[PDB]
Symmetry: D2
Subunit: 250 residues, 4 copies
């Protein structure tokens, strides 16, 4: 049988590109989404038209709360219910917005969303994936610029740094079970939908390799490498895919 992967926040953008590339490589995919129901079903429809019964959707809020563990448990369970196995987990879903230190969500909600989606949910999903258990691995979407952060993004930066810690800790602890745990760290890839072209070009111009953002496919390419048999001895590694951005001084 074909292996199966869960990709979180897979309805659009980088998460879709990953689910699509995994699907093209022969994986069955759970397309997790939160709010983007139309886009999720649309993608699953496309993949199922390509090979029937190879894609399902799974809705869940990944904000931290007392029920986040159950929701993460259910995402993994969805993969086993659909396909009878779960070989790969990609932790892609992420909230991203400013939380200035010197200052209409409460700070408690910001913490829940930015730390929950970027770090706590990846942890609980990792726990569930491991407990529910060939080439098993987890790939965490990290951030190449965590050490040179955008001004006023403390909470998002904290969550991405915690995700590096999870990557290392989980690679260590799960290696005995043959589960590898690695990261992919974009620099600038698909810019935010809300960002104007002028601001987008300011970022593009900073990138040494080509003065352009990574395509979603270029990010997926690295994920596909880490899940592949060509990475069978790689665990605890985070591959930057940033066209040299993180090497550029102020």
């Amino acid at each position: 049988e074909a292996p199966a992967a869960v990709v979180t926040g897979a309805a659009k953008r980088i998460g879709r590109a990953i689910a699509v590339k995994l699907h093209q490589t022969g994986y069955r995919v759970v397309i997790h989404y939160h709010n983007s129901a139309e886009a999720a079903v649309s993608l699953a429809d496309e993949l199922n038209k390509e090979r029937s019964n190879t894609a399902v959707v799974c809705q869940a809020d990944l904000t931290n709360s007392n029920v986040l563990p159950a929701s993460c448990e259910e995402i993994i369970n969805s993969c086993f219910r659909a396909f009878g196995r779960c070989d790969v987990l990609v932790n892609n879903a992420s909230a991203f917005y400013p939380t200035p230190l010197v200052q209409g969500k409460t700070v408690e909600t910001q913490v829940a969303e930015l730390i929950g989606t970027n770090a706590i949910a990846p942890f609980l999903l990792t726990m569930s994936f491991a407990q529910r258990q060939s080439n098993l691995s987890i790939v965490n979407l990290c951030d190449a610029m965590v050490d040179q952060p955008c001004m006023a993004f403390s909470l998002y930066n904290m969550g991405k740094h915690a995700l590096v810690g999870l990557t290392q800790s989980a690679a260590l602890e799960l290696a005995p079970y043959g589960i590898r745990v690695n990261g992919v760290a974009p620099g600038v890839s698909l810019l935010p939908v809300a960002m104007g072209e002028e601001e987008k070009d300011k970022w593009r111009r900073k990138v040494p390799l080509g003065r352009r953002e990574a395509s979603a496919e270029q990010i997926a390419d690295a994920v596909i490498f880490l899940v592949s048999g060509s990475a069978q001895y790689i665990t605890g590694s985070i591959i930057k895919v940033d066209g040299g951005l993180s090497l550029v001084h102020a």
Copy 2:
């Protein structure tokens, strides 16, 4: 007149050593405590005997919750109330225990991520908002990249605190607030740990085959708050006797 400092978890061990050394350097101090009221008070008593009305205590739980923001505001306020100013914040309080991948999990999150990361962030917010040699010092961990087996939440918390150190250094630099870290390796070992396990750790340390005293940790804190560190921000000083250099 004299500058004032808040030290979280200051009743015992490393945070006590930090409080005492700050006091000895001429700071007035807020000794924050959670469960260790008796100890916090005994320390305040010792400090006030040295110099009258230069040490107060402040109780707060730093577990993440709907009230954590209010608690953190209160800790900072208690500094301004007692002393009229708040020059230094030392984020020392910390929970530490295993959370195997294979207390409810969400309590473990609230404690491990709340004490180690979220409370530092909220205290930092309150400290900056209420604003000279202003600085914040976060107690990190030199072994974050070579973590203890089954300690993922703790490690996540400590990595998040590195993130906070950097992001806050960047954002607060315009206000003249410096933000730095001190990363112990093995210092005062956990009360719970057996004596044989303790010696196993001591033996691994290149520099002298022993743990750091609490005062050795406090020494690095004192440097970072001093006028000798006025251009230093976003730096984390390991104080680990070379432990993190030692391969498997």
Copy 3:
């Protein structure tokens, strides 16, 4: 037309596996070697049997000296003379032995350990870029550089320098479309003459499978980095270490 690659120290072990895998991927290869002439030629003959006129050998000492720059220029030149192009440079050759702080002279130890691990890569990179679809350099780094073996300071210095080169060259060559990356093994092929009981001490420390990487596993990461799947990746170093570097003392 087929692309071409130079692999330094390609006669044996990891560099051999890299040359083979590049050849399998459709590259013509320059097999650089220092002392291992018989192994290099054997490899070239094997490759040429697979596909005629796709492999040459090139002898050179990579120890630091006033002739090192000329040597390095000649290695790159040999690829252009054999194949008309040079698409990929793999800085694999490396000396590795203890240099305690407290029977070669120290200046020899410096020339060999810094020359092979750092200076020769720099000179090869300069010659590669000066001579210029999908150009890239891959440097063989070391996952354990921040947790070094006792009494290996010169080796460790050389490998950290190579990190610096990887970063500095990625930045500087990115406008020419040349990517520069690294692959950092932890423990891979150990000396054949090292006792199994000592090899097992290292094997036991690796989380992922309690074994060293094969040379082929290291080569797989090189192949990824030179591939079209890594078109946006520059300045990156991929650890291929089975989680060894994550293990505390």
Copy 4:
């Protein structure tokens, strides 16, 4: 007796400030210099006027060559000759200039000067210091920007990375002899004499903490800390003194 320190490249700028501050703390000082004979002798005069017989000069080229080991041995020997002990070594001397990868000194000379001064001479001095052996320690002047380097400075950057490696390897190997080895990593401090004012101001404006370069004295302060009794458990550590510069993205 008073402890003694060697400071390489101590005639001017940051090395001079370290020598002065060590002297102020109680140390006897060897002022190593290469070309700056007048400024070296002038500094030694000033310190000796303050406390007689507490400063000597020592001339040496730190370019790599087959005789660099003997010159390094000579620098340490000169400390023992003057003061009968050598407690502290400060590796401060450094060449710094561009070495572009793509097109009056030969490349052989560039390597010898940039790798010799920044790395090989530190190693040889460390070896001589250790071989001749209270509170013993070495401090290497590193560079906070080594992961976000200046364009076309590959050989310099390679040398400074090697110096980080040396700091770690020697901290490990010398810990059993009670010798601690640490680094101080400036961002922008005293800017190059040859740099125009507009370019100096460009650099200043990048620094978050104050929009200005470090004083030599601020760099020296961290050196003083690391050699002091307040750093007795610190080895293998590199303290950035960069005003946040390395945190700033492109």
